[PDB]
């Protein structure tokens, strides 16, 4: 969606944005797995365990 400049980071020293990015990706990774199981129309027990 957006392409940011990595040089707007060392000089700035605001590494929280990179952690926001990493966690956001992980969080989305989990949504992408849940999205796939809900599309696949699997099960209540399978979603519950995960």
């Amino acid at each position: 969606d957006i392409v940011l400049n990595p040089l707007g980071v060392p000089s700035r020293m605001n590494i929280g944005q990179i952690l926001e990015t990493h966690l956001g990706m992980a969080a989305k990774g989990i949504g992408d797995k849940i999205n796939a199981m809900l599309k696949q129309q699997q099960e209540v027990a399978k979603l519950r365990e995960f």
């Binding site: 990595p6 040089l7 060392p10 000089s11 605001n14 990179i18 990493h22």
Partner: protein, 1362 residues
């Protein structure tokens, strides 16, 4: 409309009547429903003219059929509304009123002329006491105040024969009677008797005022106003709002206060009312008049509706918010638009994106023009609608005019000239401006939400000016430093770095290519990495002895990437330049090289191509910023935990009572400072060479491809200083006060701060950002101050015909040579035949420019010192020559005559300071002070050569130095200065003067956190004026009882021991004094304040022992916040509280008389028979010790040098050498690069006026202080005619004062002090003939500089021709 000069004189009551076209006799503004002027009111049309263009009030005469007809009924003329702001009015004051500007604007003026104080005059005005005008009976003399009691005594007793009155009436009669002719002669006679300093000053100033007053033609009665002018109604508007409301200026309200009270006085004078009431009315009238001229001055400013003060007249001429600075020198401008800027990485250097709908509105009259030509528009309202409908064919016409048309792009703030550059607009669909990346540096334009103003150059001359001077391609190098400001950064640098940078084997190592094209072939084919070392056959083109290019073909071992970059590289530069890994600093040399070799065209192309390939390869690589990239120290917790226990150790020693608070404070900073550099280097050592796992056979060591490091190592963004906070330690932050927090920030950005670690980070963060907003005003104000004084300087003559200059020596300081002679004497016309070592053949001539290639031969010959033709050594009256200045560093060859330097110089000086408060103030928060200088180690072998040194051998067997400014040289085989150090006072030398040392040897050693007081004689210590409680204090410990004594200064000292100086007197075994060898000075070292003493009374000492230890607390990051006020003070020429004394004329020193320690000096020169005495403090120590061969201006005392003391004695080239060194010292600390010639400009201007000493052919006489150029033009006619020479002595002037000194009063009032400037100029009756820029920019004429220099001089021959 075209004039020559502007005059200022005093407004005579008769003169004011000439402008006025009627007398406003009523406060009535307008009628309430009929919105029209009232009968002889403040908006009266019978006085100020008609409302509309050619229309009377009642409506009897209309438009031009009745050209200049005067109506009967209303009595109103039928002219344009033009006259409603031109026509003035007046008011006939019942009783005379005093002018506040000739009473309160100091000098008193009205009181200065009468030889009468303020109080005396005011108590006359407010009717507290009478004043004598002229006593027939010599009983009462003139200007003698009589209280209400004392007036009555003289009335019945003497009376009649004495004339004394009260109020503004009296003082006017006093001014009307006083004779300027007689009291001028009287003062001249009293001057011949016994003249002092203050007496002669007062007399000479009054004398000149009296003569000036007679020659100005002004009469002192006009100080009092019998007539009061009224401002035109349009200039104090009563206009109606859209909402049925009205709005009026505060002047109208202030005017109604004056007229009401004045008319009420007419009424009371009709009634013959008692005087007590008449008094109040007169006091009121004066309050109203003074409030009208300058409201907030005499007393409380009359507040109005919204409890705020009424804006008066003076206020609209006063300062920033006045007409000058706000509505004349600065203007909102047509053909102007501003918008958010964004990147233009596709653009070439001479291009910039301009939105269509922006350029549409901007070029509106150019569309209507090209439209009538094609015949598409018959008229202009037809063309107006064509544009409005935005029809298709109108875009194509707009597109036609814009081609080959430059536009100006400005960014705020406008620091230096490069703050505006011109480009060729490229229409783009979108509301964003697209700017060229390389020139982003000049503006400091960050694409983070910046806006840039656009301006269209209308006139063909403006199109040529914009393309010639203000085009981005013609502006490369900074004017401040001969260095390219146009330089990639960010992505572009990183892309080239990725390309050039090499790696192990990779795909296709050691292969062999036909050309750099086969390298592009293989890389993009996927059978080679940009980091593969392969032999390639490249053919480089090297310039020969002439203009022809020589071709050379050879096998180069580089990388695939380097080979591809050669394609961008023009043929004329060598290949060795792209053979390295390219960084920002390396790239900046590529463009400079390219420029100095090929020229302009090749560079613009090169610049663009560098940018394009930089961006492209920068995105091809795929550099990222992850959290695994910020690698911290593996043993950080190991360094700190044990560096904490280090500080915890001293903390427990302090509470015991040995190491003092100040010594601990400096000692703890040194521990943390070592630990900080320890983490910095161990994190960089584990990051830089982190790729220790290679291949090939087993292993190899290599540079790390850590994303963050590459981005710092290349010199793209951040540095080792920033990475410290990320993976290492944040560092120590700074408080908003200036002191540094004892506890720094331990954590970094990866690990995460705890709750306090962040609270601590705040303290440093807020104070760093507080000095970004508030301190910027001091540096931006300096830019303003510098400019005004350096407005007038323009290159006038080609050759001044002078053979003078300033001996410039290599600036060697801090071991390695800070600034070389080559860079110091680059682009400067040598004012002395400077050849090679062997004096037998001239190498370089006189009138010649030093190009970089001529400076290369200075290296071969190794020049010692050079007399460069300087600015200050110029003889050109009103400006300078191109030879004196030398090269325009921005251009790259000899400066054009007519180019306005002064402004270029001021900008260059103020630009860095002002910018160095936003770059490292928003991203920086951790101070990095590393003042660990404890011992000098010499690096090359040499003989030790000390200068200005007076040392004495100690008990230990070590040469201890007892002189403050000791320097240490390093002399090579042939005999020339290579390295140079500052050895401080009480330093211990390894080897004395003349001895050989080896390389890597500690030649000097001392303690940094202490300033010792060391003796010159051996014996016992005596306590003198060291009474406990008054001057010193005492603190003991336990069992034994070691007590330390701490000397109190005037801050911690009582009124008892104020005149007592505390000193540790030396004595022998008997108890008598010990003479210092070869002087009549009993040994006595004066201890200053807060001086800690360990030896108590009655302790044996040898020579070289430390008596006391003065603490050296200096833990405040100077940066640019606490270093610019030092620059200011220098420029403003402010004497310090400890100036050093210097010898006047050379002779034989002879010590004289004394005053309770205050030393005099009866110097009696060999030739000079008349003695010379000067006084000296007690606590201050000298350098010379009496009876000596002193020369002109030997260093007697130690301390900061007074700039006035330097020029007064050691001439021009000494004070110029001082300011230049002193200023640059502060900027060099910050890495700000400025050519010395720019400072020399301001220096020259600071040497504008000069006091005269000796009577001349002209009526100069003594005490007058005229400009240096004017008096020298008089000396031109004198050496031709003979007559009497006018000897002189040049004076130094501060910036703020040098601006107000110029003969131009317009330039002075436009600056500041505007209330005073005008009053002094009015009384003098001075006429400004306009020479400066500010002067002609105001009137909106051609600037007598730059483009207009050719025009203004063509008008000067109109004057010369008859």
């Amino acid at each position: 409309e075209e004039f020559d000069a502007i005059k200022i004189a005093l407004a005579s009551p008769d003169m004011i009547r000439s402008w006025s076209f009627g007398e406003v006799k009523k406060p009535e503004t307008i009628n309430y429903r009929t919105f029209k002027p009232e009968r002889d009111g403040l908006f009266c049309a019978r006085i100020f003219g008609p409302v509309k263009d050619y229309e009377c009030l009642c409506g009897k005469y209309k438009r031009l059929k009745h050209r200049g007809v005067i109506c009967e009924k209303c009595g109103v003329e039928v002219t344009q509304t033009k006259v409603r702001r031109e026509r003035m009015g007046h008011i006939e004051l019942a009783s005379p009123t005093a002018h506040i500007w000739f009473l309160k604007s100091l000098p008193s003026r009205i009181g200065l002329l009468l030889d009468m104080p303020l109080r005396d005059i005011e108590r006359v005005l407010y009717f507290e006491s009478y004043v004598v005008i002229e006593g027939g009976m010599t009983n009462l003399e003139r200007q003698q105040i009589l209280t209400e009691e004392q007036y009555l005594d003289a009335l019945e007793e003497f009376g009649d024969e004495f004339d004394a009155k009260m109020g503004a009436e009296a003082i006017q009669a006093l001014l009307k009677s006083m004779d300027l002719e007689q009291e001028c002669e009287q003062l001249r006679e009293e001057l011949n008797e016994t003249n002092s300093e203050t007496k002669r000053k007062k007399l000479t100033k009054r004398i000149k005022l009296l003569e000036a007053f007679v020659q100005s033609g002004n009469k002192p009665e006009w100080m009092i106003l019998t007539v009061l002018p009224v401002l035109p109604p349009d200039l104090r508007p009563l206009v109606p709002l859209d909402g049925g409301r009205f709005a009026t200026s505060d002047l109208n309200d202030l005017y109604r206060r004056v007229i009401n009270r004045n008319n009420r006085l007419k009424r009371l004078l009709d009634l013959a009312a008692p005087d007590i009431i008449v008094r109040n009315e007169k006091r009121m009238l004066q309050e109203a008049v003074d409030a009208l001229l300058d409201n907030g001055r005499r007393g409380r400013a009359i507040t109005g509706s919204n409890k705020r003060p009424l804006k008066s007249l003076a206020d609209m001429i006063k300062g920033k918010q006045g007409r000058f600075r706000q509505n004349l020198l600065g203007k909102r401008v047509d053909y102007s638009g501003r918008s958010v800027i964004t990147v233009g990485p596709y653009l070439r250097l001479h291009q910039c994106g301009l939105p269509k709908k922006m350029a549409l509105e901007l070029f509106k009259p150019f569309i209507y023009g090209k439209l009538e030509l094609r015949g598409l528009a018959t008229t202009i309202k037809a063309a107006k609608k064509m544009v409005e409908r935005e029809e298709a064919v109108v875009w194509d016409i707009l597109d036609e005019v814009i081609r080959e048309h430059p536009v100006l792009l400005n960014r705020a703030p406008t620091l230096h000239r490069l703050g505006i550059q011109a480009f060729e607009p490229v229409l783009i669909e979108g509301k964003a401006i697209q700017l060229h990346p390389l020139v982003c540096a000049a503006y400091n334009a960050d694409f983070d939400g910046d806006q840039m103003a656009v301006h269209v150059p209308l006139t063909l001359e403006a199109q040529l000016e914009a393309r010639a001077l203000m085009m981005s391609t013609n502006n490369i190098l900074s004017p401040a430093n001969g260095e390219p400001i146009i330089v990639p950064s960010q992505d572009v640098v990183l892309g080239l770095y990725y390309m050039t940078r090499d790696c192990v084997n990779a795909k296709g190592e050691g292969m062999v290519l036909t050309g750099p094209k086969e390298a592009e072939r293989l890389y993009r084919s996927g059978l080679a990495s940009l980091h593969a070392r392969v032999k390639v056959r490249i053919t480089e083109y090297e310039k020969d002895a002439n203009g022809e290019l020589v071709a050379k073909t050879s096998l180069k071992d580089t990388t695939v990437g380097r080979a591809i970059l050669w394609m961008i590289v023009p043929k004329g530069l060598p290949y060795s330049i792209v053979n390295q890994a390219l960084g920002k600093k390396a790239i900046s040399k590529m463009l400079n090289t390219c420029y100095r070799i090929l020229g302009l065209k090749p560079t613009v192309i090169f610049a663009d191509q560098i940018m394009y390939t930089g961006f492209a390869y920068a995105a091809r690589s795929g550099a990222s910023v992850g959290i695994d990239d910020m690698v911290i120290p593996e043993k950080k917790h190991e360094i700190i935990s044990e560096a904490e226990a280090e500080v915890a150790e001293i903390q427990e020693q302090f509470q015991s009572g040995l190491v003092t608070a100040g010594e601990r404070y400096n000692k703890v900073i040194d521990i943390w400072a070592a630990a900080n550099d320890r983490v910095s280097k161990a994190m960089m050592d584990n990051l830089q060479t982190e790729t220790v796992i290679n291949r090939d056979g087993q292993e190899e060591k290599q540079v790390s491809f850590n994303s963050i490091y590459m981005m710092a190592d290349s010199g793209a963004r951040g540095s080792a200083a920033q990475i410290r906070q990320l993976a290492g330690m944040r560092g120590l932050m700074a408080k908003p006060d200036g002191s540094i927090i004892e506890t720094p920030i331990t954590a970094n950005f990866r690990e995460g701060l705890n709750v306090l670690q962040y609270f601590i980070s705040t303290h440093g963060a807020r104070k760093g950002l507080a000095d970004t907003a508030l301190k910027t005003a001091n540096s931006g104000y300096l830019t303003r101050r510098l400019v005004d004084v350096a407005q007038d300087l323009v290159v006038t003559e080609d050759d001044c015909g002078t053979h003078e200059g300033i001996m410039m020596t290599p600036v060697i300081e801090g071991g390695d040579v800070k600034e070389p002679l080559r860079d110091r004497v680059l682009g400067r016309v040598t004012a002395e035949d400077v050849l090679k070592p062997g004096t037998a053949d001239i190498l370089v001539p006189r009138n010649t420019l030093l190009h970089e290639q001529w400076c290369d031969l200075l290296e071969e010959n190794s020049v010692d010192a050079v007399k460069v033709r300087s600015v200050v050594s110029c003889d050109t009256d009103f400006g300078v020559c191109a030879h004196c200045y030398g090269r325009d560093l921005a251009r790259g060859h000899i400066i054009n005559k007519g180019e306005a330097i002064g402004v270029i110089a001021a900008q260059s000086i103020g630009e860095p300071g002002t910018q160095l408060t936003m770059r490292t103030f928003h991203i920086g928060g951790a101070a990095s002070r590393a003042a660990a200088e404890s011992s000098i180690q010499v690096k090359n072998k040499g003989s030790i050569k000390l200068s200005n040194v007076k040392s004495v051998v100690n008990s230990s067997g070590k040469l201890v130095i007892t002189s403050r400014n000791t320097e240490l040289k390093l002399i090579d085989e042939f005999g020339r200065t290579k390295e140079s150090y500052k050895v401080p006072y009480g330093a211990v030398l390894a080897k004395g003067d003349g001895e050989q040392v080896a390389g890597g040897e500690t030649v000097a050693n001392w303690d940094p956190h202490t300033m010792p007081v060391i003796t010159e004689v051996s014996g016992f210590v005596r306590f003198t004026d060291m009474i406990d409680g008054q001057t010193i204090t005492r603190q003991t410990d336990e069992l034994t009882g070691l007590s330390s004594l701490v000397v109190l200064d005037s801050a911690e000292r009582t009124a008892g021991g104020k005149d007592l100086r505390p000193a540790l007197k030396i004595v022998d075994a008997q108890g008598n004094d010990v003479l210092i060898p070869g002087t009549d000075m009993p040994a006595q070292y004066f201890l200053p304040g807060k001086a800690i003493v360990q030896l108590e009374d009655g302790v044996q000492i040898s020579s070289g022992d430390t008596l006391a230890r003065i603490p050296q607390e200096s833990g405040g990051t100077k940066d640019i916040t606490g270093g610019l006020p030092r620059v200011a003070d220098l420029f403003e020429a402010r004497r310090p509280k400890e100036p050093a004394i210097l010898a006047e004329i050379s002779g034989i020193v002879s010590f004289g008389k004394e005053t309770k320690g205050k030393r005099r000096l009866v110097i009696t020169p060999v030739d000079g028979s008349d003695p010379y005495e000067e006084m000296i403090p007690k606590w201050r120590q000298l350098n010379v010790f009496e009876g000596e061969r002193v020369e002109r201006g030997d260093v007697i005392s130690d301390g900061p040098e007074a700039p006035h003391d330097i020029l007064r004695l050691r001439g021009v080239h000494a004070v110029t050498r001082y300011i230049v060194n002193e200023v640059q010292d502060v900027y060099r600390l910050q890495g700000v690069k400025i050519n010395d010639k720019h400072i020399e400009v301001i220096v020259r201007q600071m040497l504008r006026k000069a006091t005269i000493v000796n009577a001349g052919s002209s009526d100069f006489l003594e005490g007058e202080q005229v400009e240096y150029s004017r008096v020298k033009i008089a000396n031109r006619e004198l050496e031709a005619n003979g007559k009497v020479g006018a000897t002189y002595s040049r004076d130094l002037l501060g910036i703020t004062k040098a601006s107000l000194a110029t003969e131009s009063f317009i330039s002075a009032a436009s600056f500041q002090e505007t209330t005073r400037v005008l009053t002094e100029a009015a009384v003098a009756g001075k006429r400004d003939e306009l020479r400066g820029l500010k002067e002609n920019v105001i009137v909106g004429r051609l600037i007598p500089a730059g483009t207009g220099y050719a025009y203004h001089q063509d008008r000067m021959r109109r004057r010369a021709a008859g």
